[PDB]
Amino acid sequence: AQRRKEREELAQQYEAILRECGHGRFQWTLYFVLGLALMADGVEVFVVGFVLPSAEKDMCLSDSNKGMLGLIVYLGMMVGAFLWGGLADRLGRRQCLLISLSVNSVFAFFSSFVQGYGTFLFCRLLSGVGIGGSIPIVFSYFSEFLAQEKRGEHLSWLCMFWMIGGVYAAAMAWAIIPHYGWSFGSAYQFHSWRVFVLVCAFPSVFAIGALTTQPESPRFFLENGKHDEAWMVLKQVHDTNMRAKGHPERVFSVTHIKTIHTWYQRWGVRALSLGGQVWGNFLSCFGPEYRRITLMMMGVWFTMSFSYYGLTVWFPDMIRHLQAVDYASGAYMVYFVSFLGTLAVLPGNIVSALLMDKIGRLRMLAGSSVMSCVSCFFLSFGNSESAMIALLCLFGGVSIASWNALDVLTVELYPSDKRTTAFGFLNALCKLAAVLGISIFTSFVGITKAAPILFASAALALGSSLALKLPETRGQVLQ
Ligand SMILES: COCc1nn2c(CN3C[C@@H](CC(F)(F)Cl)CC3=O)c(C(F)(F)F)nc2s1
Numbered sequence: 001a002q003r004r005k006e007r008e009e010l011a012q013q014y015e016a017i018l019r020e021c022g023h024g025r026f027q028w029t030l031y032f033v034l035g036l037a038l039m040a041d042g043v044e045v046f047v048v049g050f051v052l053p054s055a056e057k058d059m060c061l062s063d064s065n066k067g068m069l070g071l072i073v074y075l076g077m078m079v080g081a082f083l084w085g086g087l088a089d090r091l092g093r094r095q096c097l098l099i100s101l102s103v104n105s106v107f108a109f110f111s112s113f114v115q116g117y118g119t120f121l122f123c124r125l126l127s128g129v130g131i132g133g134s135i136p137i138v139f140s141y142f143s144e145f146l147a148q149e150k151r152g153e154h155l156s157w158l159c160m161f162w163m164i165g166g167v168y169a170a171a172m173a174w175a176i177i178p179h180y181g182w183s184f185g186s187a188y189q190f191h192s193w194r195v196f197v198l199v200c201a202f203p204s205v206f207a208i209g210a211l212t213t214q215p216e217s218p219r220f221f222l223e224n225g226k227h228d229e230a231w232m233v234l235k236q237v238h239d240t241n242m243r244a245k246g247h248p249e250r251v252f253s254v255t256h257i258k259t260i261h262t263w264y265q266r267w268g269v270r271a272l273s274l275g276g277q278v279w280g281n282f283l284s285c286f287g288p289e290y291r292r293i294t295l296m297m298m299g300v301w302f303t304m305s306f307s308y309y310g311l312t313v314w315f316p317d318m319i320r321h322l323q324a325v326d327y328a329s330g331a332y333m334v335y336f337v338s339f340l341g342t343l344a345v346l347p348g349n350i351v352s353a354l355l356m357d358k359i360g361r362l363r364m365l366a367g368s369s370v371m372s373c374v375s376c377f378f379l380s381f382g383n384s385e386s387a388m389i390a391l392l393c394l395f396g397g398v399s400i401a402s403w404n405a406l407d408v409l410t411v412e413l414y415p416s417d418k419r420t421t422a423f424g425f426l427n428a429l430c431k432l433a434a435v436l437g438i439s440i441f442t443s444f445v446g447i448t449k450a451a452p453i454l455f456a457s458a459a460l461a462l463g464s465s466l467a468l469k470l471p472e473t474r475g476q477v478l479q
């Protein structure tokens with residue numbers, strides 16, 4: 001009964017406290033620290049999508065087992081997303097981010113030394129389970145330090161690190177394992193898939209190391225009744241910002257903050273309680289006051305992920321076909337296209353970041369979705385490799401804006417006590433959509449050119465039609 005009023009008061013006071021702390025060196029530091037975490041997810045996604053389907057041809061496998069590994073890893077990412085997103089609302093943002101990154105790093109490290117396909121599959125699956133939790137936790141964790149004045153722009157600036165991780169993975173793949181030799185094969189060669197697997201883990205290890213230095217989210221502390229810890233963290237933020245700005249004498253004035261109020265047997269009971277609470281949050285996401293928002297969010301996210309991850313398998317085959325037609329008269333191609341795509345995304349992320357708080361989230365999302373639909377439709381007309389690459393750059397440049405807007409909107413539409421639960425559920429749905437799109441678009445490879453693009457464009461059109469119905473959030477305190 002009373003809790004809604006108490007939480008509204010908490011949000012209103014928290015916004016004022018953040019305005020007192022201001023924006024400065026602390027948020028700039030946290031920005032890079034969490035950017036490393038996003039980069040790790042980018043690296044893993046690239047490895048699953050482009051390296052491993054290329055390595056499947058050298059590692060010995062039965063024909064029926066060829067596509068198994070990516071499916072398994074994406075399902076692991078789905079499970080990890082739901083698990084860590086749910087737990088981050090009960091144990092904390094920093095805690096769960098540390099745990100998930102540790103899992104990812106440990107099993108990525110272990111996968112370098114295995115001597116068989118089964119054990120490699122196991123270790124890679126658990127690495128996926130680990131990394132699946134990063135994005136939902138990262139975005140909420142960063143959002144909880146941002147004042148409403150420029151929260152959208154600051155959240156939008158965060159998405160570059162994912163593309164940077166993709167570029168990092170592609171460059172390391174080209175440098176270390178050209179031709180994608182993957183024999184289960186090193187003897188300390190420094191030019192081997194084991195060394196590539198190790199090098200891909202560096203962003204996650206650095207993320208863990210840097211993240212150990214950062215404080216836990218004070219909003220999480222306040223929502224769980226820990227007044228003094230939240231006060232200490234907020235004082236740390238204020239003092240860091242003011243000392244960096246050359247005003248060490250300024251005093252943090254906040255006096256009091258609103259707050260909300262055998263060994264194995266004990267562990268079992270604890271786990272049961274945690275499961276019950278996570279399930280309660282997940283079911284609350286479909287309560288009468290959030291059901292419609294959740295369903296519309298599901299539709300939009302599913303359609304966007306479906307179209308993108310279907311194109312991830314459509315485009316390389318189109319390039320191969322065009323190259324074959326031209327020749328009728330490698331890793332470097334992937335690295336080159338990835339680098340150009342990142343350079344194309346960059347202007348789109350700059351523009352969307354600068355406009356996010358100027359024109360609102362809904363208009364950004366709708367315009368970017370329409371432009372994404374049309375740019376996807378244009379792919380059917382490419383007659384040559386250069387034109388195809390240019391059109392892919394166009395599509396990425398326009399779609400990054402819609403993904404940014406939907407990230408901000410997803411952050412702001414859900415309350416802090418279940419934000420990471422909602423975000424994790426949506427991210428798990430996105431990875432399920434990735435699985436489905438990859439399989440369905442793989443089924444088209446032998447048939448025709450146009451139907452996959454028409455299908456993706458229709459999916460994006462439906463996504464935009466749903467996106468038009470979401471409520472605007474610009475100019476509101478973080479619920
Ligand atoms: C909707 O379309 C997306 C496609 N991206 N993409 C690429 C390169 N990437 C890889 C992407 C990033 C990550 F997912 F890997 Cl982490 C960004 C990008 O541009 C290629 C290839 F270069 F291999 F040919 N083919 C396609 S489709």
Ligand SMILES: COCc1nn2c(CN3C[C@@H](CC(F)(F)Cl)CC3=O)c(C(F)(F)F)nc2s1
Binds near residue numbers: 399403404426
């Ligand atoms: C709801 O949960 C799922 C989310 N995934 N996701 C990502 C990761 N991307 C970026 C996409 C490729 C693009 F070219 F379109 Cl930017 C594909 C993808 O999966 C980001 C990002 F950091 F990139 F901004 N934001 C969110 S939300």
